[PDB]
Amino acid sequence: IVGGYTCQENSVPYQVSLNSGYHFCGGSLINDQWVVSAAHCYKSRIQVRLGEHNINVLEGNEQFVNAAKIIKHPNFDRKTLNNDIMLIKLSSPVKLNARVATVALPSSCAPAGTQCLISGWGNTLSSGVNEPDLLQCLDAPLLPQADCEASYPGKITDNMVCVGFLEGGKGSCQGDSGGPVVCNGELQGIVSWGYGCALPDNPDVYTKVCNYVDWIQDTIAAN
């Protein structure tokens, strides 16, 4: 998160860190045993860390669970990043409480102009690398599809939505993929891609989660 603020501790209780030795992507808890994230964050051993605020200090509040099943969407396309979403089934259910909780899946697709909160431990600078210790947060709006298409001509499918500021200065960055974009208390997007970080006329584009609610629901059911 370039240009954001430190989240108040344990205010984003559904935020998880996918870890393989080091933090490499974020995710969201949607019930006791499943995590949703981006398909490009696939690895074969993933450990999910819940209740984290400072990713580098053992704080006493955390739950560490290994990923038992990792299921990407059947039509994820590694070149266009169309359908970039995957589900992770934890090896055991977590214990839900004040700082580890669930986020609601969408009731419908949020319209343009809705304010969203994006959070993550991704890089905080546009030039250079600086990995925060503490979870960062960002309040940003969903853009009109036209503005989104005009910024990335020919590359936006019906499964993508842009959030941000065409002036640049703020935006998600490397290490934030998989993370939550929550608008009106519902998970509307998953951090996926953009050119650079917080560059003018290159906003953030996210997987449009409202198009996947029956897929998620049916996949939990079948396994």
């Binding site: 080091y22 981006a38 490009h40 590694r78 490397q174 290490g175 993929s177 998989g178 891609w193 953009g194």
Partner: protein, 56 residues
């Protein structure tokens, strides 16, 4: 295998944080970088040993 080894390091457009190694042609040595998880190019190896083994 040289043509790969001259390409500039690229993060790609995705926003994961994966440490990778690339060969640097001026300095004649594999250096570390952060790859975003999609796109990018061939000068992108998972270890120093494998990078120097291809390009060194």
């Amino acid at each position: 295998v040289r043509e790969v080894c001259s390409e500039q390091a690229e993060t790609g457009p995705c926003r994961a944080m994966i440490s990778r190694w690339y060969f640097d042609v001026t300095e004649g040595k594999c250096a570390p970088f952060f790859y975003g998880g999609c796109g990018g190019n061939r000068n992108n190896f998972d270890t120093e040993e494998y990078c120097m083994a291809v390009c060194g």
